[PDB]
Design a protein around this ligand. Sequence first.
Ligand SMILES: CCCCCCCCCCCCCCC(=O)O[C@H](COC(=O)CCCCCCCCCCCC)COP(=O)(O)O
Lengths: 49, 431
Amino acid sequence: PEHDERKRLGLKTVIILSSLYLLSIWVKKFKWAGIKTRKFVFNPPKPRK
Amino acid sequence: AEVTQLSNGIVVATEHNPSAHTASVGVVFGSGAANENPYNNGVSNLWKNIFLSKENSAVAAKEGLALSSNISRDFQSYIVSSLPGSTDKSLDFLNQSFIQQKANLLSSSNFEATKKSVLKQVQDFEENDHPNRVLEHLHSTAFQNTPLSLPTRGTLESLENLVVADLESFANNHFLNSNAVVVGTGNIKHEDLVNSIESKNLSLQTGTKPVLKKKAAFLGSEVRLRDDTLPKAWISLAVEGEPVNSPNYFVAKLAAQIFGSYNAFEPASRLQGIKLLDNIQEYQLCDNFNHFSLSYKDSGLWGFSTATRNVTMIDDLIHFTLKQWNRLTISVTDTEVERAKSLLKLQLGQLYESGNPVNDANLLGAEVLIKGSKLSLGEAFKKIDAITVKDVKAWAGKRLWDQDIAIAGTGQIEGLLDYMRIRSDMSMMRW
Ligand SMILES: CCCCCCCCCCCCCCC(=O)O[C@H](COC(=O)CCCCCCCCCCCC)COP(=O)(O)O
């Protein structure tokens, strides 16, 4: 007997949670931009330490 | 203590002071290390040296004349110092072998002995002078791919690929008549210098130097040079600042005096009226710090520089300092503005009213090249007294509240966190 009520609250939950899942992918890639573009150079030290 | 400019085609500035015992005469050019490309870098550092080379300075010591020079960004200088009844011999030394017959200084044996002395100054600088080679990397990472980032000494491989053909190529384009100011400070009248210059027809030829393709631009970045065999950690950090002839010039200098400088081993330094010193001294987070406000004709840099030996609590020293910067926007008090007014007038007075006429010749030559005339100490004191609390909060919310930073460090900097954990500290999130 809950069948028509169930599919109407399933509409509100899926729309909300899909727009929260898409925004978390954008937010993660902005805060992770400095680590993916970090660089590294090696010059060997002069050897009598 | 009044300044006098008089252009007969050549700008001649002079501040007389008849209570001095010496007198300086030199020429200051308006092209510095920010007028070079990355292949002739540090070529002005080889023009200072060969002016101070041993065969050139032996000739000056036979008449009682001392030589001095200085290479920076936006200007260079070549000063000749003497006794106040002997300034006509000072012009004749600048005229010969620097202006007119400047060919015998650029020999093959005098150049080769000089270059291998400049090659060992920059090599000892790169291994020993840690608070000054970190501040150089702060200019190198904040203005990258832009004129304002080349080091004033040059680098070790840009100095090795430098031949004698490169120096006259630099002098032909930059030591011109309109890019030049002739200064004289100390015990010397303004009119005896002007007549003695135009007693001959001292001049130069062309003018209209090259016109500086790329402008200056700030970029948020960081550079890390970790060295685990050094016993300390050195760190600098800054934001964009106020340039020369900016309307917030004295307002940015007053803000750095609010936080000032510190030395942990001086007892009177630990008693200053700085609110940051309550958190520092509880666990002894550093050895020293100092706040600065650099300014050029393009932009500026506002920040601080530290050196610590507590290598496991580095992230608390950065956290507590950047939290106090937030208070300039939201909750700065009126007794902190009045304390920094008195200390700024004392710091400006000891730089512009010292006893060295060589020091006052680099200061006078820069302000006449970039503005045409000098600003008095009475007019600068009148401007500092008229700053309010509202002007500091209007400057701070524009320049430091939620803005990008530039970081540089060396030593045991493993405890220094990455960029976004430091970048988020530029807004308190309590306003
Ligand atoms: C502590 C319990 C955690 C539950 C985990 C959720 C697992 C997903 C299954 C969905 C069941 C939840 C029922 C929601 C519902 O019926 O609301 C429905 C529709 O409302 C919604 O869409 C709510 C979206 C649910 C997303 C929750 C956001 C996560 C933020 C933290 C939440 C935990 C503190 C009720 O609608 P109405 O009360 O306005 O009439």
